[PDB]
Design a protein around this nucleic acid. Sequence first.
RNA 1: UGUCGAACGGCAAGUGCCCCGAAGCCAUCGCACGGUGGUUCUCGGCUGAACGCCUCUAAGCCAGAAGCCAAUCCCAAGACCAGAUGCCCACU
Length: 186
Amino acid sequence: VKVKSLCTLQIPEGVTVDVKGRKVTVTGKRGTLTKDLTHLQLDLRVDKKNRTFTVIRWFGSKIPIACLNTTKAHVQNMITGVTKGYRFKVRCAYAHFPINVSVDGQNIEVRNFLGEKRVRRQLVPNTVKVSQTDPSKVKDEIVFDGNDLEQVSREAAVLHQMCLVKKKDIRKFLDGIYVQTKTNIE
RNA sequence: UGUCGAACGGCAAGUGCCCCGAAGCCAUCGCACGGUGGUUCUCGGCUGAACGCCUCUAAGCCAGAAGCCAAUCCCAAGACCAGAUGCCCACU
Ligand SMILES: [K+]
Ligand SMILES: [Mg+2]
Ligand SMILES: [Mg+2]
Ligand SMILES: [Mg+2]
Ligand SMILES: [Mg+2]
């Protein structure tokens, strides 16, 4: 086993990172985020004066060490989402039947997917803001905005998986809703 | 067809036989009724290391089968219910 494995993260000036019992709270200009990491058993340390975040594993084999960079990646995603946000833009791709998408508040209704009469409905959680781009700018573009990368990507994924083609060749029939661009709000 | 003499009333033929026949029972031969949520598999994904890349997976998470569990339905305290309650008595 290795005595000491260490990962360090730098923190931007605006961000505030606090750890207490493997629970990380990240505060930026556009909100706050929380992460429950009590399943990890790592030594999380924040240096406020030097604005560094450190995660340490003591006496670890390969499996515990693999969690260090996972923790650093989660905290970095929280910092980025609390200072810039996440914006996932999905596109409706169809051959013949135009996929009709309605965004009334937090509810997404998908109609006419491959000409079907069934209505696919998604209730986006309140931490993710879903909008629909004007068709004159980009046709069939739905945008997800949020501070949490995991929540935004999960919403885009559940929208993608509501429109899977069943009982047809998948190489053909490329109809679906696919995330195209993953960028930041600011 | 016998038989009480006839008529009436019947009776006998282990319900004489034939027609119709209420009540009751009864026929998918008639009529009524037969629900709702979860945990997950296979699988597809998200975030994400290991392995500066990548990766559904290693930690975490999402969606999810006529399966499985509970709701509903049936029996139900030897499941010994210090659950509630009405009277009488005992103790007070
Ligand atoms: K999976
Ligand atoms: Mg075919
Ligand atoms: Mg007779
Ligand atoms: Mg019957
Ligand atoms: Mg990935």
